[PDB]
């Protein structure tokens, strides 16, 4: 018998969209959205890669930066260490690690300074829904 050993690397498709309405029904297509600060924000993250049965979309950390650059030193974390932020009451999460979609809502804001644009950047970590317990329960 002859064994040839070959391999490869693949990527999974995870998406993020702005919801035009609460309860996360319709997505947003426009290139720049113009709201008031008092208004809230409806966002969700989709998972389109595969094996949604064995995997659960789970949010580890997310933040806001004034620029498209994600590594901006000025970061307003919206989720800290798998936890919705406690010091700000207007932050709420609906599902995290529960299913293949992660969503959350928060009041809109503006970065203090000569900054007129806000960008949102999150980082996801998939998990095994049987091998490890993916429910994040956070308390101060």
């Amino acid at each position: 018998a002859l064994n040839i050993r070959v391999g490869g690397t693949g990527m999974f498709t995870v998406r993020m969209a702005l919801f035009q309405t609460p309860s996360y029904t319709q997505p947003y297509q426009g290139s720049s959205v113009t709201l008031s600060t008092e208004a809230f924000l409806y966002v969700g993250t989709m998972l389109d890669g595969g094996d949604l049965s064995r995997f659960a979309l789970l949010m580890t950390n997310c933040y806001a930066t004034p620029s498209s650059n994600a590594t901006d030193p000025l970061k307003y974390f919206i989720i800290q260490d798998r936890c919705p932020h406690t010091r700000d009451s207007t932050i709420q999460v609906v599902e995290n690690g529960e299913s293949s979609q992660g969503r959350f809502s928060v009041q809109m804001f503006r970065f203090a300074g000569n900054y007129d644009l806000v960008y949102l950047h999150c980082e996801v970590y998939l998990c095994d829904t049987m091998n490890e317990k993916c429910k994040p329960t956070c308390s101060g």
Partner: protein, 283 residues
């Protein structure tokens, strides 16, 4: 030869034509038979009183295949009840493409003329792929690949693994496997239900597709703290049963567990702004 010839567009040279009296004494040079009559001369001595001739002729033997050059033939003539009673000298030459040329000579006497069978207008050349040259074997056109595509051993085999987000596929050049000596190949995963098929994106490929999960075609998943890998093995054989040189394609592609994601839509807030203006002066 292939470029300097005179075409012949006539529909009465079929071996189905009833009867005529024309004879070809003024035919001099290289000719191509094109149209409803056919592209090749008759290969068997068609019975007498056919194809607009009292005594039909026929180029005896077999049509030369591609890359044969000048071939000398002695076209026979069917008359009086004896096939090949009179003889004429012809020089048939094959050409690139589904057509031929001949050195049509003057028969010894009139009431003699050539005529063509339907031949293989059904047998086409476009069915050969881009790396498959339009070669012929004893007059039948086939798709023989590049000669430079000649690999002997097994380790040098090409393998195109695409680790798609939802499915996984592995692709191998059909020309390479034909060169390796396998007329037909058998793709089989851990389960034989995942038999391979053909697909073309830039050439002839045989490919297998397996969903990226745990068990859809017996694929095994072993996830460590950083990556999750899908491992399955492919089996190569040239017949249903193997007798030597077992082949096992140990392929596996893994996915990351962490990734970065952001909106593609710009956000712009407006907040109530109070502007207090002050001033000063200095030296």
């Amino acid at each position: 030869p292939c470029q300097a010839h005179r075409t012949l567009d006539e529909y009465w040279r079929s071996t189905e034509y009833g009867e005529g009296y024309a004879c070809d004494t003024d035919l001099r040079g290289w000719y191509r038979f094109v149209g409803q009559g056919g592209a090749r001369m008759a290969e068997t001595c068609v019975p007498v009183l056919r194809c607009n001739t009292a005594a039909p002729m026929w180029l005896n033997g077999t049509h030369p295949s591609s890359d044969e050059g000048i071939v000398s033939r002695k076209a026979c003539a069917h008359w009086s009840g004896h096939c090949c009673l009179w003889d004429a000298s012809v020089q048939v030459k094959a050409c690139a493409g589904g057509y031929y040329v001949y050195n049509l000579t003057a028969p010894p006497e009139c009431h003699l003329a050539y005529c063509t069978d339907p031949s293989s207008v059904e047998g086409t050349c476009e069915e050969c792929s881009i790396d498959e040259d339009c070669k012929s074997n004893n007059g039948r056109w086939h798709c023989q690949c590049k000669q430079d595509f000649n690999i002997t051993d097994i380790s040098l085999l090409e393998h195109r693994l695409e680790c798609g987000a939802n499915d996984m596929k592995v692709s191998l050049g059909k020309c390479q496997l034909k060169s390796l000596g396998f007329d037909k190949v058998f793709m089989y995963l851990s389960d034989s239900r995942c038999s391979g098929f053909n697909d073309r994106d830039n050439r002839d490929w045989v490919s297998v597709v397996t969903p990226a999960r745990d068990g859809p075609c017996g694929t095994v998943l072993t996830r460590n703290e950083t990556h999750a890998t899908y491992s399955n093995t492919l089996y190569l054989a040239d017949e249903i049963i193997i007798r030597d040189l077992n082949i096992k394609i140990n392929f596996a592609c893994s996915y990351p567990l962490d990734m970065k994601v952001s909106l593609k839509t710009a956000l712009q807030p407006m907040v109530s702004a109070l502007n207090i203006r002050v001033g000063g002066t200095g030296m």
